[PDB]
Design a protein around this ligand. Structure first.
Ligand SMILES: C=C(C)Cc1ccccc1
Length: 157
């Protein structure tokens, strides 16, 4: 399911860390800020958790943020007039791949979206790889793309 999939892709770290773009993050890939200021990240963390964390959270707190973040990704899809029709056209496994992408990059994939809605899976997979996303995080992008190409969990198993 989407939680297991993103837990694999994001890991779990209980202290503030930097993501692949160098941005302060915590938990299961929860972005805190794009600001280079660790103090700004710590303020965002305390606001998100509701207590003075000093840059460290518990596993329960990380999992709660993760639930909120997955929910937010789903809502960003459902509220977006470009994403919702494609998402609704997908089966349950491919819907997880869609949520995964939105979780990672947030709300340029117009042509890939069309190919996915048309169920041209190999063509969509080729188009999805022609991206900064694929070049910068190729192993994760390959897993997500394989999920779109096959409609199976094979890349995660
Ligand atoms: C961005 C993509 C090509 C994947 C996707 C599809 C549907 C909804 C959200 C994301």
């Amino acid at each position: 399911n989407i939680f297991e999939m993103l837990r694999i892709d994001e890991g779990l770290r209980l202290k503030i860390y930097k993501d692949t773009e160098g941005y302060y993050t915590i938990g299961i890939g929860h972005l805190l800020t794009k600001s280079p200021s660790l103090n700004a990240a710590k303020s965002e963390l305390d606001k998100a958790i509701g207590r003075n964390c000093n840059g460290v959270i518990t596993k329960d707190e990380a999992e709660k943020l993760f639930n909120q973040d997955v929910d937010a990704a789903v809502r960003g899809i459902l509220r977006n007039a470009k994403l919702k029709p494609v998402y609704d056209s997908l089966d349950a496994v491919r819907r997880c791949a869609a949520i995964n992408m939105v979780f990672q990059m947030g709300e340029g994939f117009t042509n890939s979206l069309r190919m996915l809605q048309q169920k041209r899976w190999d063509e969509a997979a080729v188009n999805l790889a022609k991206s900064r996303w694929y070049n910068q995080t190729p192993n994760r992008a390959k897993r997500v793309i394989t999920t779109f190409r096959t409609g199976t969990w094979d890349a995660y198993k």
